[PDB]
Amino acid sequence: MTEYKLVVVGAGGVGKSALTIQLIQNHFVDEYDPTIEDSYRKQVVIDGETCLLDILDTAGQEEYSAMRDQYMRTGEGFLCVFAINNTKSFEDIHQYREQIKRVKDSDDVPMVLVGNKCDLAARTVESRQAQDLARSYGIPYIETSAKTRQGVEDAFYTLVREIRQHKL
């Protein structure tokens, strides 16, 4: 059984808790406490491998945490979340990437770029813009909907695959 330590980062409000609850329990949760930082487990087989996904759902701006720190330096990959209809969120992706690298002290740290809420029409970021950013980073880009559950497993399974690859 393989264990993979993932960290879910991104501006607050983008879909971290929803994305994560969806994978974990298969239900879209709105109303999830914006401040609750918690990690969840999920046993899943990916590509014929039995995996134990230990996910840190991050929360809290400025104020530091033992758990976040640890998961941050010890995490294997990071899901970088932004909201499709929220431009600052998207623009913030570069900072989260920059923080991850500083801690890891490394360029190649696995990540996937998640453009969430692909369910909404109130769209304010183009797939094209996001794809290209993904492409500048050398990392994949997934569009998800924690609401519709669309793309949710892809996102995380892709992240696992990256990790797996980064190991080789």
Ligand X SMILES: Nc1nc2c(ncn2[C@@H]2O[C@H](COP(=O)(O)OP(=O)(O)O)[C@@H](O)[C@H]2O)c(=O)[nH]1
Which of the stretches 59-67, 101-109, 110-118, 119-127 binds Mg ion when contact is defined by CB under 5 A?
A: 59-67
> Which of the listed partners (Mg ion, ligand X, none) does 97 bind, with a CB threshold of 5 to 8 Å by partner kind?
none
Q: Which of 10, 17, 22, 118 binds Mg ion (CB under 5 A)?
A: 17
Binding site, annotated residues for GTP: 13-18, 29-35, 59-60, 116-119, 145-147
Sign of torsion, CA 23 29 34 37?
A: negative
Q: Least Å distance between CB 106 and ligand X?
A: 25
Which of the stretches 52-60, 101-109, 127-135, 146-154 binds Mg ion when contact is defined by CB under 5 A?
A: 52-60
DSSP 83-111: ETT-HHHHHTHHHHHHHHHHHHT-S---E
Q: Least Å distance between CB 19 and Mg ion?
A: 9
Residue 42: is it exposed, middle or buried by C-beta count within 10 angstroms (0-12/13-18/19+)? Answer: middle
Asked if 116 is part of the footprint of Mg ion (rule: CB under 5 A), the reply reads no
CA distance 83 to 13: 8
- For residue 160, which phi and psi values (nearest 5 degrees)? -65, -45
Sheet strand arrangement including 49-57: 38-46, 49-57, 2-10, 77-83, 111-116, 141-143
Q: Least Å distance between CB 164 and ligand X?
A: 26
Q: Smaller CB distance to ligand X: residue 14 or 56?
A: 14
Give the interface with Mg ion as residue ranges (CB under 5 A): 16-17, 59
